[PDB]
């Protein structure tokens, strides 16, 4: 069973979701990425639940040396594309996990837990309603406060029954619980059986197993405290992971929408170097603006922006020029502050073959700015924003040069 | 075995950092932080291997080890800036040495040997030209790109007029080794592999700081014959062109580094806000970025203090055990307006609050261009200032007190 064991699954598409990319674009990305990095792409593509800042920190994907010239534009495009695959797949994970969590226990399984818990409260002379805890375990509308309360409640019952939670947990290795889920934080399960079974549930979440969650009270048909209390710790701790997963994916969606504006901006610099890509760059811009201004209550759909970015970057690759957005922007800035003109350099600028429809007022316009640290005190660093409207003239001048 | 002139990669005890740039603790911090598979590329880029600044930028693909994943998006730009400064310092030294080797490749007697062999060529061709002018020009750096291409073409036509089919000869030669140590050199068509071999050792010796003078065929074989002298002239001319381009590259690199210090300071500000007890170290980083951009002095910019400050700062960021993701953080701050400073993987609360958290927060206004509309002819961006993180950071401080 590859979907619940400790194995790393990778399908035919490098774990890209189906119906997000063309076969060609899937092949393009696989061929462009360093071979040593393909496993990390497949893992991040999988939707492995994680915070958005962990995704960003783990996204250290290199292109092959032969793509060095476009590395500063192609790597951001690919990293965005992976983040989109992560979001699409992770959304399927979240929905599937939510269903598994809500249906792990049917009426008869809730009754078995609640009966066993009645037995516990009685033996301990406790006034608590066993129905309450069994309902909470099924409840995703649960504060971080109540969660840790219920967990602490379960720990006491365990200790009161003579279970050395401490000793038992210090002898167990929980590392397996988070191999496929970076948002999950494991309670102190008190048996290796439990750890092993719940680790298979967590693996199955990420690897899209179709089986329901295994729980010990169901598997053994047992009302006994060891089975039902660990089971409740599992179900509560999955509910908390799910709440955090939902919030991570919302924050990832917002990041991708904002980053869409930033990527369009650095892809503009590359468009100015290869102005025959105008119609391709226009689509990159319209799809970025569509994401940022979308009104749909529907989720944002990043597939058209990604497709546009990749069809653009393939023509940039064909131009055989160095795309260095920061360098180019810094050179434009230096020149403007008045050979310096980067567009006079063949390694930078690829002159279009017909000029009427590509440069001059036919140049797609985006305002270029750069901010600079212009004063510093012991309390503030002042930045000044510089506008570089001069781009069209410099490009004009590099066209002229080639004549 | 002459390592300074063959095709071997020299790497000193400092990963090719120049001396008197970085403390020893900082050199060791960087060697230990970088993925081992990338140390070779760090040493090669540190060496100053002549290249255009855009080539340095495209090649700066340097990964930190996995144990530093949390700070990767701040530490890597810092390491990459530091390598680019090593590259400027060392390449500035290469340029000065290459300039001296080019200006002195031929002494008086060697100039006489070439002018004599050249007068023979001119006599046998019934040409009026002064052999002195061409020999003077191969030792002159004050040549337009125009006069250069013209002297090459003159040599090329002497070669055909002597029966030398320049095309047949040069097409089958291997010029690979000419550029292994110099990405600015643009080879002429040489006439023999013997020429290419010796000229490749000259170019190797430039980047690897051989103290030998250039080898030329006319000098080594004490020959006046046209192959020797005409191939030598092509070489001295073409290395003269590389030096001119190399000086232009270092000027452009110096200016990128000064402007980029302003971007690095903006990246590192996001991390200061996550770890506000770093205020006095961050303030130094910013003061040093400001000095670089605002210095009136004539003497060259000196990046060593900015680097040391960035490195001292990032060490404290590593210690705080938080994820530094400047674009994520800025997007989240832009989005509000969930608070990233409430997340303990993001924000490290200081112990003394009066000196760090509220109005004691060092201020840098965060500014962001945003795409707001587009047409078939444009993508409209407008610029927006972000609220102060003071209230957001403040909010994070409350949440960790109760």
Residue numbers in the entry:
A (entry chain A): 8 to 345, 376 to 440
B (entry chain B): 7 to 343, 377 to 441
The authors write:
We previously identified the tegument protein M35 of murine cytomegalovirus (MCMV) as an essential antagonist of this antiviral system, showing that M35 interferes with type I IFN induction downstream of pattern-recognition receptor (PRR) activation. However, M27 alone does not suffice to efficiently shut off the type I IFN response in macrophages, and we identified the tegument protein M35 as the first MCMV antagonist of PRR-mediated Ifnb1 transcription and later on the MCMV m152 protein as a modulator of the adapter protein stimulator of interferon genes (STING) of the DNA-sensing PRR cyclic GMP-AMP synthase (cGAS). Both M35 and its HCMV homolog UL35 are packaged into the virus particles as part of the tegument and therefore enter the host cell directly during infection, and both inhibit type I IFN signaling downstream of cGAS, as well as of the RNA sensor retinoid acid-inducible gene I (RIG-I), but upstream of IFNAR signaling. Our results suggest that M35 forms homodimers that directly bind to specific DNA sequences to antagonize recruitment of IRF3 to the promoters of antiviral genes and thus impair the IRF3-driven immediate antiviral response. Based on homology with the 85-kDa phospho-protein U14 of human herpesvirus 7 (HHV7), MCMV M35 is grouped in the pp85 protein superfamily that is conserved within the Betaherpesvirinae, but not the Alpha- or Gammaherpesvirinae.
Since previous analyses of HHV6B U14, a homolog of M35, indicated that the C-terminal part of the proteins was disordered, we generated expression constructs for purification of full-length M35 (amino acids [aa] 2 to 519; M35_FL) and a short version of M35 (aa 2 to 452; M35_S) corresponding to the structured U14 N-terminal domain (aa 2 to 458). Similar to U14, two M35_S chains form an antiparallel homodimer with an extended interface along the long protein axis. Most of the residues of M35_S could be located in the electron density, with the exception of the most N-terminal residues 1 to 6, the most C-terminal residues 442 to 452, a fragment of 34 aa in M35 chain A from positions 344 to 376, and 31 aa in chain B from positions 346 to 375, respectively. The individual M35 moieties are comprised of 14 α-helixes creating an elongated main body with two protuberant β-sheets forming a hairpin (middle). The β-hairpin of one monomer reaches out to the β-hairpin of the second M35 protomer of the M35 dimer (top), constituting a prominent part of the dimer interface. At the opposite site from the β-hairpins, a groove bends along the interface (bottom). Due to its bend and asymmetric elevations of the walls at the interface creating deep and shallow stretches, we approximated the size of the groove with a width of about 20 Å from wall to wall and roughly 83 Å from one end to the other. These dimensions could accommodate a B-DNA double helix at a length of approximately 21 bp, indicating this as a candidate site for DNA binding.
